[PDB]
Design a protein around this ligand. Sequence first.
Ligand SMILES: Cc1ncc(COP(=O)(O)O)c(CNC[C@H]2O[C@H](O[C@H]3[C@H](O)[C@@H](O)[C@H](N)C[C@@H]3N)[C@H](N)[C@@H](O)[C@@H]2O)c1O
Ligand SMILES: Cc1ncc(COP(=O)(O)O)c(CNC[C@H]2O[C@H](O[C@H]3[C@H](O)[C@@H](O)[C@H](N)C[C@@H]3N)[C@H](N)[C@@H](O)[C@@H]2O)c1O
Lengths: 408, 410
Amino acid sequence: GKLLAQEPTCPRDADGRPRVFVEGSGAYLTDPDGRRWIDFDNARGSVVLGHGDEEVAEAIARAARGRSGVGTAWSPVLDSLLGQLQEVCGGDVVGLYRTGTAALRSVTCAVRDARDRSIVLSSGYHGYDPMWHCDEPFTPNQHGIVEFLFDLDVLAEWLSRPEQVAAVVISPDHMHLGERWYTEFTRLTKEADVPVIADEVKVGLRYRAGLSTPLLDPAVWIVAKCLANGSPVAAVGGDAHLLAALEDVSFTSYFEPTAMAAATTTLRRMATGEPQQAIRAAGDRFIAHTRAAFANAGVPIDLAGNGNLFQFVCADDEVADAFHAAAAAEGLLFFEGDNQTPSAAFTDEVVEDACGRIDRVSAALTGRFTDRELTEESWYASAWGAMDGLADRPRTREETTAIVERLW
Amino acid sequence: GAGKLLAQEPTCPRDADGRPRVFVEGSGAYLTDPDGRRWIDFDNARGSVVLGHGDEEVAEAIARAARGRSGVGTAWSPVLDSLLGQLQEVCGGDVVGLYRTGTAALRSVTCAVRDARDRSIVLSSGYHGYDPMWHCDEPFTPNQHGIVEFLFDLDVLAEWLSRPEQVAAVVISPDHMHLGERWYTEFTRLTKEADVPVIADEVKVGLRYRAGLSTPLLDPAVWIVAKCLANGSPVAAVGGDAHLLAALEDVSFTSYFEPTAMAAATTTLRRMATGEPQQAIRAAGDRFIAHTRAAFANAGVPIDLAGNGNLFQFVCADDEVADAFHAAAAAEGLLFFEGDNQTPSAAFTDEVVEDACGRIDRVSAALTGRFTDRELTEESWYASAWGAMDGLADRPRTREETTAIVERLW
Ligand SMILES: Cc1ncc(COP(=O)(O)O)c(CNC[C@H]2O[C@H](O[C@H]3[C@H](O)[C@@H](O)[C@H](N)C[C@@H]3N)[C@H](N)[C@@H](O)[C@@H]2O)c1O
Ligand SMILES: Cc1ncc(COP(=O)(O)O)c(CNC[C@H]2O[C@H](O[C@H]3[C@H](O)[C@@H](O)[C@H](N)C[C@@H]3N)[C@H](N)[C@@H](O)[C@@H]2O)c1O
C-alpha cells in the first residue's frame, strides 16, 4: 500500500485502510480470519451474476486455454458479442473499451469532433480522466465541459444558445430523478436539437434487458458494469456519423479472449431480464425488511431506490458512521455512502441471512439517535454521494446555490 | 460476420484486401483457422503473448481466480500485494500504479507529470496509444494539447530543451533496432542538462529482453510496462518518482481488483522476472533469424532483418517486395505483424523453430527470381523504421534533410 501511487475505491476500515478479502463466492466474501460477509458492493456493481459464477468461469477457463480465439486476431466470439450488443442496446454501430473511463472519454471526444462545437454539458460521474475535473459547477472547465449537477434550470440556460453545445452527457439516476425530470430533460434537449450521450455504465442492463429509460432518446450509449460480471469490458453504440472518429481507436488487448468470453456469457443472461428480476425481488425483500426494522426501533435511517440499486439515507454523518460500524460488525459489506447493488447470488437464503444481520445492526443503533430527524439536508447529502449531483426536489436558485456550497 | 457493426478499426492480421483474418483456437506458438490450417504466430497480440497462447500455468491461475479462489473484485487481496511488490522489485521506483491499457497508462502519467512540473509542453517520440492527446497535424511544434512530436530527432529535441522552464517531460518509446547506443547517450545527456524528466514508454520493450527495462543508457523518472506483463490479459503498470506521480492519487476504476487480470499478471511477471522466457525466445528467434537471412541470401531475395530473436523486423527493398513477401508468408501459414515488429513467445521452441524454417524455405522459393536485381536503399530503412518505431531512423542528416525526409514520409 505504501507502494501504491493510486487510491482505488474499495471497502476501507475505520482507519482508511483497505479491507482484505481472500476469497469469495456468490454473495459471500471471506476475510483473513475466516469470517463471512455479505457483499452489496460487488466490485462497484460490476459483479451482477455473483462472484465466481460458474457458467462465466467455465467460459473464461476455456478461453484461457486458447479454445475460444486468440488475442492476435478476430474470432467468431467477437461477432457474437457485437451482434448481441446491438440487439439489446440499439444503434447503427458499436465499439468496445476496457473501462468506462476510456469509453466515456473516447465517445465524448468523437461526438465533439463530429459536431465541431466546443461545449459539452455534463451531469454524473463519467470516470477518472482529468477532462471531467472542475473547480466549480455551472461554468466551463478548461476542456469545455460544464457540470450542471442535474439542475435543469442551469441546463436550460446553457441550451438557450444551443449552437455552441456539442452534446449533453448524463449518467442516469433513478433513485432521485423521476419521470418528471426525464420528460423535461428530453424536452429541453430535443428543443435545442443537441445530441444526448447516455452514460449507462452503471444503469445499463441493471434494471432490465436494455437501457434504463425509454424517456431518454440517446444518440450514443455506453454500458459496462452489467456486461461481464466484473471482467474489464465496456461497450458503446449509436449514431454512425457521431462516432466516426472511433475509426482511430485500437488497443493491444482488443481481442483478448477471456474478456470476450465473460462478456458474451454474461450478456446472454442479462438479455433475458431474469437476473434483474430476481435481484429486484430479493433486494426488495431486504429493503422492506430493513425499512421496517429501522422505523420500529426509531433509527433515523431510510432507504431510497429498489432491489437492483438502493441506498441508505442517514440523518447525519454521526448516524452514518454508527450505521457503518454496526454493519461491519455483523459482516454486511455496503458501499459506504454510495449505492448498494446486489447480484443474482443474493438469493432467498442470503436475504434471510442479511435480514438477521440488519436486525442486529438495528439493535446496535436503538435508543442512540431517536432524537434525530431526516431533513432535506440528509437527502441531498445522500443523493450527492450516490448519483453525483442534485436530487430532483423542488428548489429556487438560491437554494441550489446554498446546497452546492455545503456539498462541493 | 460483424465488421459492418464495428465503429472502431482494430489493428489485427488482415488479408490482402484488408479483411480481418479469423482464427478460432491457439496453442503455444500455433493458431488454427476455421478450416483447421495451422499457422505460426509472430504477432502474438502485438507482442503481449510472451509465454504462448493458452499457457497452462497462467490458465490454471486465471481459472481459479475466475471462481474467486484468491480474492474478488470488490476488495484488496494478498495477490495485489504480491504484484505491486514484484513490479517495484523488477522495474524500480518509489511508487507504482496499474491500468487496463498502455493508452490509459501513458495518458495518466503524462498528465500527472505535467501537473507536478507546472509546465505545459511535453516532448514526445514513439507511439503512446490511441488517445487523441497525441494527434498532430505537423511534427516539431506543439499540438492542441502541448505535445511536441520530435520523431527521435535530437536536433529538434535540443532546441526544445533550451526551454527548461517550459518543458515538463520527455516521453519516448525506446527502439533498439533503429536507434544506436550513441543516440541514447546524447538523449540522456540532453535531458539531464535540461533537468527535464524522462517518461520511458516501455509498453513494448519493458521486460522484452531481460528481467527489467530495456536499456541502462536511460535513467527514467517514470516507466510504463504492459505487453510483457500478463500474457495478453489487460494489465499495464507504471512507476517511479513519487512527487511526479502524485496526481495518480486521483485514479480509481471499477475493475481495479478484478482477479483474473491480477492472476495473469502475477503469474506471468513471476516468470518474466527470472529472465528465462526472454533467454529462450532470444535463442530460438536468433536461430530463426539466422536461418531466414541465409535462406533469403541463397535465394537472392532483397529483404534484410533487423533486431534480435526477442524483437525483429523485416526491411524489404520496397513495398512490392513487401507485399509479395507477405502473400508468400501467409501461403505458408507464417503470421507476421505486417510492416511492424515480430515478437515470438516462449512457446517458439526448437520443434516450432524447425517448422518455421521450413516455411521460410518455401517463402524463399516463392520469391526466388522475382526481385533478385533490387536492393535495400536508405529509403527502405527510413520507411521500415517509420512503421515499426513511429519516427526517424538514426542515420546522418542535416536539419534541412530532416525537413525533406519528413515531407516525404508525412
Ligand atoms: C456512470 C459511470 N460512468 C463511468 C464510470 C467509469 O467507469 P470505470 O470505473 O470502469 O472507469 C463509472 C464508474 N462507477 C464507479 C462509481 O462512481 C461514482 O462514485 C465515485 C467513485 O467511486 C470514485 O472513484 C470517484 N473518485 C468519485 C465518484 N463520485 C458513483 N457514485 C458510484 O455509484 C459508482 O460505483 C460510472 O458509474
Ligand atoms: C510503446 C507503446 N506505447 C503504448 C502503446 C499503447 O498500448 P495499448 O494498445 O495497450 O493501449 C503501445 C501499443 N502497441 C501496439 C503497436 O503500436 C505501434 O503501431 C501502430 C499501432 O499498432 C496501431 O494500432 C496505431 N493505430 C498506429 C501505430 N503506429 C507500434 N509500431 C507497434 O510495434 C505496437 O505493437 C506501444 O507499443
